[PDB]
Amino acid sequence: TRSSVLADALNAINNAEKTGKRQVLIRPSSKVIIKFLQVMQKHGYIGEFEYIDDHRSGKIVVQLNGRLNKCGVISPRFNVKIGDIEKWTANLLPARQFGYVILTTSAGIMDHEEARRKHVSGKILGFVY
């Protein structure tokens, strides 16, 4: 039984890249997948993507460029206490100057840098670099 619909969307994207592909079908999409897809895109880590409407849960086609090393999900959505954000980025980003911890907060799904700027925190979704 599909536990995380996000998890299947990231690992799909990840396996595409690793195999040199330029697109992936993903299934079944969600509000959360879209927003996560949206953040990566805003930052160049993927191209455009299309939501196809099966009369169901959705499918998505992502077009990816090849700037992407890894997009991972964080399996329990642990609470982060805004000061703990440093400890996450460090644990799991390649350097202090690029890459993002993306996470869910009362003020929207946003990467940690926007989170820092907006001075909000919340729970941790996953990451890109």
């Binding site: 399996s75 329990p76 959505r77 642990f78 609470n79």
Partner: protein, 140 residues
């Protein structure tokens, strides 16, 4: 995820599981079982000079020559101990209440005897290195 829970509410399972597995720690388990050093508890041990080994050695200041055979007082176990710098052997006679320590050399010499675990520090309450330097005198 292989094998641990990851859930946001799996904190208890995660603590218990740790507790359970700490018992594989040799140090931890001794700490909690209250198991509680070479011969006893202490750093040193007092002992009685039974006899002086290696008096008949020809070659002076050897390793066979320095050995005295001391029995520990708290157990009756008898054991051999170096007495450092052979001229020291003049100070120990027999039945002379010696403190044993750990010998604990770092790297082996040419003629050393492995299994000489101990060294003699004080005898009748005064230090051998205080005796060898002619600071104190042996009380009787």
């Amino acid at each position: 995820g292989k094998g641990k829970p990851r859930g946001l509410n799996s904190a208890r399972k995660l603590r218990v599981h740790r507790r359970n597995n700490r018992w594989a720690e040799n140090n931890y388990k001794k700490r909690l079982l209250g198991t509680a050093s070479p011969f006893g508890g202490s750093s040193h041990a007092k002992g009685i000079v039974l006899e002086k080994l290696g008096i008949e050695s020809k070659q002076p200041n050897s390793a066979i020559r320095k050995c005295v055979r001391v029995q520990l007082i708290k157990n009756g176990k008898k054991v051999t101990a170096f007495v450092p710098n052979d001229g020291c052997l003049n100070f120990v006679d027999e039945n002379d209440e010696v403190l044993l320590a750990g010998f604990g050399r770092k790297g082996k010499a040419k003629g050393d005897i492995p299994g000489v675990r101990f060294k003699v520090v004080k005898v009748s309450g005064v230090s051998l290195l205080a005796l060898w330097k002619e600071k104190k005198e042996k009380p009787r």
